[PDB]
Amino acid sequence: DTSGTVCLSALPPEATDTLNLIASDGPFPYSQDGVVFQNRESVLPTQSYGYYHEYTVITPGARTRGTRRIITGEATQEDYYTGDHYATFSLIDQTC
Incomplete structure (x- = not known):
């Protein structure tokens, strides 16, 4: 489920x-x-393979990819942010 x-x-x-x-x-x-x-882990809504893609959200000073990411959903303006290495996700609202 989303947060x-x-x-x-x-x-x-x-x-x-x-x-x-x-x-x-x-x-x-x-x-x-x-x-x-x-x-x-089915945290996000169930969709077929390829519906979602992941991208790194750089953590200042980190030598690795860190724990922050943005998962894109194929639907219009559907993007999820996780700051805890895929544990929880929140829908990102680019209008605010």
Whole structure:
């Protein structure tokens, strides 16, 4: 299940950067950016393979991809933010 919705302005600035790169279809900083997100644990609504894709939300100072990500859903304006390494997700509202 999702943990509600959150305004883009309420997320780390890096989340805005990630969405801008998604809008231009990259290029992305990490090789894992753009790969299919399987939603293996069924936290997000059930959809067929390929409906979801994942992108890194850079954590300042991190040597690794960290724990922040944006999962895109194929529907219009459907994007999910997780700041706890896929444990919980919140729908991102780019209008606020």
